[PDB]
Amino acid sequence: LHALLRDIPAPDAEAMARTQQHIDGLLKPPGSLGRLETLAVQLAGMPGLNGTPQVGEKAVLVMCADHGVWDEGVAVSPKIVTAIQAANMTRGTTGVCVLAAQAGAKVHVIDVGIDAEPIPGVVNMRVARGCGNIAVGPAMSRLQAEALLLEVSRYTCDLAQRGVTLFGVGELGMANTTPAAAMVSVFTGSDAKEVVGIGANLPPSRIDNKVDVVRRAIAINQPNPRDGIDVLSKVGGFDLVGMTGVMLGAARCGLPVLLDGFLSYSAALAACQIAPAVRPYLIPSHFSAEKGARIALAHLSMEPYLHMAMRLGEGSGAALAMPIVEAACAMFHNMGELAASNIVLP
């Protein structure tokens, strides 16, 4: 893992400079396409894209797992929904499946810790049948976290060898907004009350209990904010670790990764803490309706492109933003040039 993190490539400033120059010469007032131009330049700096903003195959990786903390009453969804929904993922009937199809992306469902029998058709990387209840102890051991990071990292960069150039990250796990809130609180240093949300329709009353659970998880585990792996293993979950692993793998592969909602933000905070070199490869999609979204994004210094008040998860937001990445590529390669039309602007 030390090797993996040491080999993450830095962005290519040379390709980025050539990109900027080419964009400024396009048939439009300089900088008029705003964030679409900055996005194109960002992509140009990613070594896996061959010095140019391009999109080949697209894949959304969905990490599924159950959480022990579900027993603390922090989630109203039946625990079996994780297993049932994971199955539905293979049938193409879920939100991310429908949105990924529209974007022409393929969905990879990965079981990293569902508490049920193996689901055929789902990639099997399960660490255990659900992680430990973070309210009374750690979610898993440091070794288990590191191994899963390694495993998912390799799987991710291996897909690149098959044509994939754009990744989307998602998750599925009842009660996972609780460990997500805990991680955000630890990494940003915010009080649990400011970062704990309603998740998948938790009643407004039950919120207090959720906040107490988050506080208890932190107190009992004493996770070290300066060590993202320590935080993940103590108050995270298998699905959160998996998402972090996709981010490290894509970065090592020098390829772009589209974030999704609140759960992915917590995973990205862990990833950037573990390896700052990962940040240049992260691309925001939407602004999650989860309460702690604003704080999490502020520490990641990211401004999402889409404001859809979405809070489904599954990587549905990542899929929805893929057309945007393709649009920046289309602008870059298909627009005409000012000089060719004899247009001169001051």
Place this chain on the structure above:
Amino acid sequence: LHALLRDIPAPDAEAMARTQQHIDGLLKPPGSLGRLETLAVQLAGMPGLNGTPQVGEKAVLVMCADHGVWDEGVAVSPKIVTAIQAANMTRGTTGVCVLAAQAGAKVHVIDVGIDAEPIPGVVNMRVARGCGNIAVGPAMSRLQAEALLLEVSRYTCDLAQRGVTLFGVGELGMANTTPAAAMVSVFTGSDAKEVVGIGANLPPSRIDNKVDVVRRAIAINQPNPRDGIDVLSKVGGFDLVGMTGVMLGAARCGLPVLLDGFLSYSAALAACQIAPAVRPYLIPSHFSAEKGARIALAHLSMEPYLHMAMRLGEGSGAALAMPIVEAACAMFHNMGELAASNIVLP
């Protein structure tokens, strides 16, 4: 025109109720897809869509015209850029062409008042070679405004008869952010300084002159805020009138219209003033980087889906948001149902 405005259909509450019920039963926590769900319901209420969120053919109508107020030094772009760019539109090399292609939409370039010889391949509906300089008088007569509204309205609803179910509106005209700022100031009652922006890269110094021009236009013409046609004819332009006409035509046709940037916001304010029944058919795309965008959107009570800091115009933002409308339709029709998976949520 009185007939046209009197025949705009009200939204179908019955179809909308059936839509909401169907969405609530989808494979996800109720309301978790946020604005995507509200958008699907909105579309279901539009009589031209056959009681269901659907998208057939897509078209972006680009209204091109020159403005007399260009002579007041409010724009740094050479005036001929309108004519040159209009030509480029027919060659598919402009920003809206590239983005429309990506969304699978067709671009209709309409000349409603370019100050140059006719451009082959462009729809000819020119009122005159540029409109009057709003700084010293009206842009056009009330009759000219009404006729163009009628003309564009019919052209728009006629396209519907050919399969088009989703419209996007755009414009092209050097100096048009000046009359746009004037209209916004009049309709919202905001001071010119709060609504005048840099347009297509106007230097920060020249801003004062632009503000004075806007104030002079209003003072000299004394447009009546309660009469959108009066405002359009006095301190508007041919391109702005044309965009308003697309909105009235789509509404009469009971079909959805995606707005673009700042220029389209001013046209939408005029449209809603002329006929409030038009509002239910308007769909925002992005949040323009133009200074007066916030104020204009607030009076339209709209919250854009995309924050791309774009300010190109041409209808490029409308095209970029088309995939979003298609996504709401895909969600509605392709997602599985909770009941079928035996999932029960409180």
